[PDB]
Structure formats: structure tokens, C-alpha cells
Amino acid sequence: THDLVYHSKINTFVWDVEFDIVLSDSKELNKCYFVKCFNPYRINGKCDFAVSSIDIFSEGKRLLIENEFNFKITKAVHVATSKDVTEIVLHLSERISSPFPIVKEVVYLDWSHPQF
């Protein structure tokens, strides 16, 4: 946990790890991660409430979430050091109490906005 970074603008953790997870439909995914984009100035519609948009990437290609994405992490693996970090992932997820506590990378779209 030496490259683990806590981003506090949106209370998440940037960690270079992959997740093997199972949803509520028994579907299995391997070597998947998440990328969060903090967009406070995004041009929202009437029904958008989140300040961040999250994209799930498995095997280097993103997923189109058509079903409910309620999922449980079965095995989290740190890429740099192949040591299993699943227990730390669940600990942080229980502590953080935010959607997708651990994220591969956080993109900040505030400073590059014309309204910044």
C-alpha cells in the first residue's frame, strides 16, 4: 500500500489494483478496475445528481452498464506487486462508505474547465 493515495475531494482511494467481482446475477468478471472522473461543472440534465462519473474497465475495455451493478469483490490483486490485497479492499470499502471506494485513477475535470 505504498502507491495507495487517498483522494479527499471525492472520498476515494486511487490504487493500482484489479478486481474479480460477482454481481447479483452470478456473472463473473476478471481483472477489472474502475476510473472516477470528478466533474463538478458537468452540464447536467434534470436527473443527474452525482458529482463524479465512474467507468468500469475489464480487460482494457470499458463496460456498458445495462443491469444493476450491485457487486461483491471476490479477489483484488495489486498489479505492481502481485500480492493479494482483497482484505484491505474490503476494509477500506467498509470504512469509506462511498460508491467504489478504490479506483484505478481519478480524473479531475475542475481545473481544466473554462469556469474554473
Binding site: 452525482a50 458529482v51 469509506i96 462511498s98
Partner: peptide, 13 residues
């Protein structure tokens, strides 16, 4: 109430 909730809302909310 969890204060972190306020960190998930955008300008409008």
C-alpha cells in the same frame, strides 16, 4: 447523516 454525502452531490443538488 454522513458528511461524505455532500462530496457526491453536484452544483444543482
Amino acid at each position: 447523516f454522513i458528511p461524505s454525502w455532500l462530496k457526491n452531490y453536484n452544483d444543482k443538488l
